[PDB]
Amino acid sequence: DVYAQEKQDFVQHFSQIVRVLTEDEMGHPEIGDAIARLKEVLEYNAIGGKYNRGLTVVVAFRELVEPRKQDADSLQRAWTVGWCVELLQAFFLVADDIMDSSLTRRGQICWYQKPGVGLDAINDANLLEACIYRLLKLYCREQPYYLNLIELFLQSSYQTEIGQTLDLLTAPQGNVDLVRFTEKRYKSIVKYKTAFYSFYLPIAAAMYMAGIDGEKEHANAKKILLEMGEFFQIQDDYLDLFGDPSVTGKIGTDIQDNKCSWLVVQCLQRATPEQYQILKENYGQKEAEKVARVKALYEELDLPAVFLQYEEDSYSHIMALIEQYAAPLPPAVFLGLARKIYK
């Protein structure tokens, strides 16, 4: 709702983002071809998603900053920082798709799978990251929260990369051991690989723009946001297998990639010794028939019902956390976010 009434404004300002990231180098004709490539990278990879993470920055900003302080300049900066969060995302996702050997994202073929792109997409990804800091300097350098934002974005990237490292270490290709796939290990992975950048980052950014820089306030917001992020990633794992491809926009690879998925973790907690063997002999392999066998095992253990039940309980737990930790922040800030990810 508040998102949907912020969305189209947010999307419309992507053109100025691309304009300014392209004309920032007008005085340097010799890099024209690189700048054109950057434009193409932006348009293929930063556009086409739902922009929920970036919109969260905008929504939270309007709810945290007093209206008489929300001038045209301040709003412009708010949706610039929103787009920076979308760029960070794009940076990680382009690399993630290479490393997960994925095929599609946002209903199109992954950038690196495009003929002519391939592993050059690695440098494309790094450029998207650099754009974040080009925008922060262009729009926010003179602001009191400038350094806070730079550090928030750098820290969030480090955390996410630690998370990705845990994700990849725990999922060695060609090497199946289910013993690694524990609940404790799972929660650590998704905290770092998803929860920080998808949920803490956007709200924290808006907070700093609102002059809310207190360690206590950020720790309290973080209590709620990291838990939401844990649920969001469990939902991402569920949908990787049971989601509707025309809705998700991407083909799942967790089983083939031998991932420490929430699904496989719950399977391990429930499987008989016989079922364990079936999982062991079919998981982490590229063969369609072996993947289908894993999915059948999941459905036979009613993991879809287990997920639906977990989602209800997670929702309740998170609402409890909001009651406890939202103050002094407007509860609407966390509620709007909760509404976006729960049904």
Ligand X SMILES: O=P(O)(O)C(O)(Cn1ccnc1)P(=O)(O)O
Which residues have a catalytic role annotated? Answer: 50, 91, 96, 100, 105, 167, 193, 232, 236-237
For a copy of itself, the binding residue among 8, 27, 30, 247 (CB under 8 A) is: 30
How far, in Å, CA of 77 to CA of 107, rounded? Answer: 30
Tell me the closest approach of the beta carbon of residue 321 to a copy of itself, in angstroms. Answer: 20
Burial code of 292-303, b = ≥16 C-beta within 10 A, e = fewer?
A: ebbbebbeebeb
Residue 125 near residue 94, CB atoms below 8 Å = yes
The listed partner (ligand X, Zn ion, a copy of itself, none) that binds 169, CB under 5 to 8 Å by sort, is a copy of itself
Position among 9, 50, 114, 122 found at the interface with a copy of itself (CB under 8 A): 122
**Is 193 labelled a binding residue?**
yes
Cβ-based neighbour number of residue 169 at 10 Å: 11
Which one, 118 or 144, has the nearer CB to ligand X?
A: 118
Q: Judged by CB, which is closer to ligand X: 64, or 132?
A: 132
CB of 219 to ligand X, least distance (A): 22
What is the amino acid identity at position 134? R
Burial 138-158 (b: 16+ CB within 10 A, else e): ebbeebebeebbbebbeebbe
Cβ-closest residue to Zn ion? 100
Considering the rule CB under 6 A, would residue 193 count as an interface residue with ligand X?
Answer: yes
Per CB under 5 A, 124 contacts Zn ion: no
Query: Binding to ligand X by residue 86, rule CB under 6 A?
Result: no
Main-chain dihedrals φ then ψ at residue 243, nearest 5 degrees: -80, 160
Residues 89-108 interacting with a copy of itself (rule: CB under 8 A): 95, 98-99
User: What are phi and psi for residue 187, nearest 5 degrees?
Assistant: -60, -35
Contact region for a copy of itself (CB under 8 A) — 27-35, 259-267, 283-291, 302-310?
27-35
Q: What tokens appear for 141 in the block?
A: 């350098």
Q: Is 81 left (phi over 0), alpha (psi -120 to 50) or beta?
A: alpha
Q: SS3 string of 57-70?
A: HHHHHHHHCCHHHC
> Measured from the CB atom, is 243 or 331 closer to Zn ion?
243
User: What is the nearest approach in angstroms of a copy of itself to the Cβ of residue 306?
Assistant: 24
| CB of 284 vs a copy of itself, minimal distance in Å | 15
Binders in 210-239 for Zn ion, by CB under 5 A? 236
Of 63, 76, 97, the C-alpha closest to 10 is 76
Query: What is the DSSP annotation of 108-170?
Result: EE-GGGSTTTGGGHHHHHHHHHHHHHHHHHHHHTTSTTHHHHHHHHHHHHHHHHHHHHHHHHT
Q: Using the rule CB under 6 A, is 230 a contact of ligand X? A: no
The answer to whether 231 and 341 are in contact (CB under 8 A) is: yes
The entry of ligand X, Zn ion, a copy of itself, none near residue 166 (CB within 5 to 8 angstroms by kind) is a copy of itself
What is the contact surface with a copy of itself in residues (CB under 8 A)? Answer: 30-31, 33-35, 37-38, 95, 98-99, 116, 119-120, 122-127, 130, 133-134, 137, 147, 150-151, 154, 157-158, 161-166, 168-170, 172, 184, 188, 191-192
Q: Which residues bind ligand X (CB under 6 A)?
A: 92, 96, 100, 193-194, 236, 240
Residues in touch with Zn ion (CB under 5 A): 96, 100, 236, 240
